[PDB]
Amino acid sequence: GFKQDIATIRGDLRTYAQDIFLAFLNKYPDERRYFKNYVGKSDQELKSMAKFGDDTEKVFNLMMEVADRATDCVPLASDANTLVQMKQHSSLTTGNFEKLFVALVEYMRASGQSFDSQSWDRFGKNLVSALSSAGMK
Ligand code: HEM
């Protein structure tokens, strides 16, 4: 289930973080606008780019924690808060999160792994709601 998926991702975090985020950026290339130096690079170039490594690990280690601290896929208010008032997220609206979660769930469903894909969809849904209740668009 959801709890195990967190352990699965943590076990191989670097690889899952890069592959999922690459799935995200390839599905929605215009989302690169928030990162900038991402454009003009293939998957392999991004995987070796220092900042992409840093960005993806920071996104996914915290994502796993927000997931882990949640109850029945409902995030803590404090976790929604950090995500909203992060200076790095000043350009974001809830739709950016929705798109990340479309890609992530699509990745899990296509994978040769027993992910609880439906829970990650539900978690994405609840996180958008919590982000909006803390202030997004
Ligand atoms: C729930 C999923 C997400 C989590 C847990 C998360 C968390 C984080 C964390 C921990 C950082 C590092 C902040 C620091 O340097 O201290 C970060 C940076 C950043 N995040 Fe997110 N984030 C998420 C979703 C997103 C999405 C969907 C986008 C846009 C598509 C985004 C855009 C950014 C950007 C642009 C940065 C700054 C990278 C830089 O230094 O240039 N985040 N995020």
User: What is the C-alpha to C-alpha distance for residues 18 and 50, in angstroms, rounded to an integer?
Assistant: 12
55, 63 in Cβ contact below 8 A?
no
9, 116 in Cβ contact below 8 A?
no
For residue 92, give the ligand 1 atom closest to its CA. Answer: 29
Token couple for 67: 């997931």
- If you take atom 36 of ligand 1, which residue's CA is the nearest one? 88
Token couple for 120: 């990650």
Q: Find all residues with CB under 8 Å of 66, minimum gap 6, and list them.
A: 75, 76, 79, 83, 127
Burial degree of 132 (CB within 10 A; 0-12, 13-18, 19+): middle
User: What is the C-alpha to C-alpha distance for residues 7 and 98, in angstroms, rounded to an integer?
Assistant: 23
Phi, psi of 71 (to 5 degrees): -115, 125
User: What is the C-alpha to C-alpha distance for residues 58 and 60, in angstroms, rounded to an integer?
Assistant: 6
Q: Find all residues with CB under 8 Å of 95, minimum gap 6, and list them.
A: 137
For residue 62, give the ligand 1 atom closest to its CA. Answer: 5
Residue ranges of domains in the chain, CATH in brackets:
1-137 (1.10.490.10)
User: What is the C-alpha to C-alpha distance for residues 69 and 24, in angstroms, rounded to an integer?
Assistant: 24
Experimental method: X-ray
Q: Output the ligand 1 site: residues, CB below 6 A.
A: 31, 34-35, 55, 58-59, 62-63, 66, 83, 86, 88-89, 92, 96-97, 100
- For ligand 1, the distance from its centroid to the CA atom of residue 37, given in whole angstroms, is 15
Q: Tokens 């899990």 belong to which residue? A: 108
Phi, psi of 74 (to 5 degrees): -105, 115
Looking at residue 33, its amino acid is R
- Specified resolution (Å): 1.5
What are the distances in angstroms from CA 78 to CA 74, 88, 137? 12, 17, 18
> Strand (E) positions, 18-118?
none
Q: Which one of 55, 57, 82 would you pick to mutate in the ligand 1 pocket, going by the greatest count of ligand atoms within 8 A of its CB?
A: 55
Looking at residue 40, its amino acid is G
94, 18 in Cβ contact below 8 A?
no
Token couple for 105: 């769930």
Looking at residue 50, its amino acid is A
User: What is the C-alpha to C-alpha distance for residues 12 and 58, in angstroms, rounded to an integer?
Assistant: 14
User: What is the C-alpha to C-alpha distance for residues 134 and 84, in angstroms, rounded to an integer?
Assistant: 7
Phi, psi of 112 (to 5 degrees): -90, 55
Among the listed residues 42, 136, 57, the one whose alpha carbon sits nearest the alpha carbon of residue 98: 136
DSSP 113: S
- If you take atom 1 of ligand 1, which residue's CA is the nearest one? 63
128, 13 in Cβ contact below 8 A?
no
